[PDB]
Design a protein around this ligand. Structure first.
Ligand SMILES: CN(C)CCCC[C@H](N)C(=O)O
Length: 325
């Protein structure tokens, strides 16, 4: 009850990033978190986006939850918001035609929700909590098998030959041809990271062809499209979003990248058209990091208070790891 945004702003002569700068999903604070400790469900592996696993609610905190990969090590646990599009209710993969990576010890054929729930004596999280159940409209113009050019987010200076390999509700999965699946990332039509076939060519940018493509220097889209019999995502399907309007020094709240259980008071350290650099007030600049303006883990001031999540105040002066802020 002691720390408060109101007096911090007066003390610092600062301003917060207006709620209007965030996506509705990042700002909404009046939804109830119906998830309960022990409930089971399905979800994508954040580090291997094309794979689906059985997950359990290991912890609830405000509008967030910590999920655990059944049968596996706790080191894989991760946090998501209750309105996350990356989780689905029990039975979702079977209904949508997706494959499942069963719990440790199980074979994909030995898994059955009904029996599993009995063996574990648990309940499945009710369906009415999921925003994504594949009941909504698919992304206009993006179908499994189409080709496009996309930025490798792990190596962002590369624009590469890619394919759509999955579609779930209003989002699709970008995959880099002949490269490892862990480079995949879910995306939507307004993403600034995707471009139609030929973009690089009109921009003078070098295009990164499929891994080990014969005579990589002579890569030709027309040729590749004939070889694969695949079509390119149509140009009209791409509807890139406008650059965000966050300004340097605006304050907000952001999940700690080192200990995701925590959320800290933060400031906009720097900006790009679609990214912002986060600085945790009072902490060393060595911890500042870049992040997409639409990332689900940044929120407007007051989010923690309204959702019931603890908020870490600025680090005290002269403390270890601090910065004369
Ligand atoms: C195109 N992209 C999906 C992969 C780029 C990999 C770069 C480098 N060989 C590495 O392995 O880090």
């Amino acid at each position: 009850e002691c720390w408060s945004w109101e007096s911090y702003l007066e003390e610092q002569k600062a301003i917060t990033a207006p709620v209007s700068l965030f996506q509705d999903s990042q700002a909404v604070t009046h939804n109830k978190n119906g998830f309960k400790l022990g409930m089971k469900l399905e979800g994508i592996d954040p580090q291997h986006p094309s794979m689906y696993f059985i997950l359990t609610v290991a912890e609830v905190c405000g509008y967030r939850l910590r999920l655990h990969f059944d049968g596996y090590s706790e080191c894989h646990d991760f946090w998501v918001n209750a309105n996350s599009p990356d989780i689905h209710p029990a039975g979702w993969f079977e209904k949508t035609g997706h494959k499942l990576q069963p719990p440790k010890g199980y074979k994909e054929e030995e898994f059955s929700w009904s029996q599993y729930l009995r063996s574990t004596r648990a309940q499945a999280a009710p369906k009415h909590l999921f925003v994504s159940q594949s009941h909504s409209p698919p992304p206009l113009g993006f179908q499994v098998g189409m080709k496009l050019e996309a930025v490798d987010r792990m190596n962002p200076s590369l624009v590469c030959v890619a394919s759509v390999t999955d579609v779930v509700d209003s989002r699709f999965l970008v995959h880099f041809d002949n490269w490892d699946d862990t480079y995949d990332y879910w995306c939507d039509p307004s993403s600034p990271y995707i471009h139609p076939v030929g973009w690089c060519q009109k921009q003078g940018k070098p295009l990164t062809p499929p891994q080990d493509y014969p005579d990589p220097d002579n890569f030709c889209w027309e040729k590749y499209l004939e070889e694969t019999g695949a079509s390119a995502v149509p140009t009209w399907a791409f509807k890139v979003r406008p650059p965000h309007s966050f300004l340097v020094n605006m304050k907000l709240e952001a999940v700690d990248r080192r200990n995701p259980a925590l959320i800290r008071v933060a400031s906009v350290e720097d900006v790009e058209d679609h990214r912002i650099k986060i600085h945790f007030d009072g902490w060393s600049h060595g911890y500042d990091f870049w992040i997409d303006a639409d990332h689900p883990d940044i929120h407007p001031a007051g989010w923690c208070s309204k959702t019931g999540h603890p908020l870490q105040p600025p680090l005290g002066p002269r403390e270890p790891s601090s910065a004369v802020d």
